Structure formats: structure tokens, C-alpha cells
Amino acid sequence: ARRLPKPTLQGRLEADFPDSPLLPKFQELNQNNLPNDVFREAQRSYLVFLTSQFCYEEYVQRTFGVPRRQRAID
Amino acid sequence: ARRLPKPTLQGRLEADFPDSPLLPKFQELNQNNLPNDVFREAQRSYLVFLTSQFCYEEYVQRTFGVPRRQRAID
Amino acid sequence: QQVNDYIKAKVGAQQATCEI
Amino acid sequence: NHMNVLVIVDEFYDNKYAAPVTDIALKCGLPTEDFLHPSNYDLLRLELH
Numbered sequence: 001a002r003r004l005p006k007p008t009l010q011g012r013l014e015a016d017f018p019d020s021p022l023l024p025k026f027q028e029l030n031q032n033n034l035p036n037d038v039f040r041e042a043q044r045s046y047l048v049f050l051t052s053q054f055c056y057e058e059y060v061q062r063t064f065g066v067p068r069r070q071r072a073i074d
Numbered sequence: 075a076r077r078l079p080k081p082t083l084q085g086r087l088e089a090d091f092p093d094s095p096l097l098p099k100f101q102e103l104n105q106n107n108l109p110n111d112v113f114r115e116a117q118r119s120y121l122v123f124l125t126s127q128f129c130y131e132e133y134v135q136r137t138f139g140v141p142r143r144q145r146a147i148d
Numbered sequence: 149q150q151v152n153d154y155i156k157a158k159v160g161a162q163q164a165t166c167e168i
Numbered sequence: 169n170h171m172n173v174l175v176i177v178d179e180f181y182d183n184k185y186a187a188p189v190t191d192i193a194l195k196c197g198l199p200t201e202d203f204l205h206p207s208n209y210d211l212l213r214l215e216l217h
Contacts, residue, residue: 069090
């Protein structure tokens, strides 16, 4: 019927950091009259889902990227 | 009947390194009505036999005398 | 019934009898 | 019939249903104070020497 108290989690983190990638993948948030703060929590959950996906992809690339024989000729 | 399963062994060593002296003494193996997978495993086994042979010669040629009498002048 | 057969195996199936 | 140990091992465990323990292990399992008991007469009467 309910959940935990929400943590602190302060600030609009995406707006202070436009330099990072994956923000064009973030802007697809339609609002069918959702209130002004549960939309922010939805955006935060979508952002942490995106940064976990980006971190998992970069870890997959860092694990398939082992020292090869081709790169050691330098 | 069967053997152990084959281990991973990623890559092809003769694809990357043409600079060892073992390359022309490898190329004489050719398939004759043989699928290329077992033929490739034959290449791998011949390559590992040749590098074991070469490091064996490298050992026995540096260990006839690891010291020598002739080096006293220089 | 197989457990019963195991039990009847692992124990027995004047002499001064005694209950417990 | 052939000299290769791995397929000898794999031909013994191929989803084995019944795993009969040897009688020698059944002898050495139990201690002495029930080895003399008449419940273990099936092990006792083949212990002769």
C-alpha cells in the first residue's frame, strides 16, 4: 500500500551537467499532466537507468577489450 | 574414444606475428580432403610443437657453457 | 511401507520381559 | 577393452540410479557395540576368519 521514505537526492543533476553524453536519450519524457515532482523522480529513475546501462556497456567494452596481439606491435 | 574439450585459445598467432623465424617452417602443412577446423587444430598443434622445439634449442644452445673460458680477455 | 520394512529390519521383529 | 581413462570414468556415472555400496564399507561403518548385535546378522554370518 506504500513504500519507503524517499532519500535526499538533491538537485537537478542533468541540467548542471550538459557536458555528458546520453542526454539526447533523456529528453524523451512525455508528460500527460503528471505533477511537477513525480515527473522529476521519473526523470531521475530514467537517468540512473541510463547511466547504469552506459556503465554496463562501457564495462562490456572494457572486458572484451583485453590486450590483443594486434595492439602490442607498437 | 573422445578427448577433453578444447580450451579457449583466442586468436591466430600466425595471423599477427610474421617476424618470428618459425613462419616458413610452418606453411608446409596443407589440407587434403580435410575440413578446415581440424586442419586448423593441426596447424595449432604444429605451431606449438615448433615453438617448443625452438625454445628447446634456445635452452640447449645457451647452456652448453653459460660461462666460457674465452671471455676473459674482453 | 518400505520405511516400515527398514524399521523392522533394524530392530528385532523365562526371559523376564520389560516395557519402557 | 580400450586404454583411455576419461571415457572409462564417464561410462560409470551416466546418470546412475542405483549406487550399491560395497559390503566392506558397510562393515567398517558401524562400531563394535552393534556389530555384535543380531540386527547385523546379515553382515556377521559372512565374517568367518
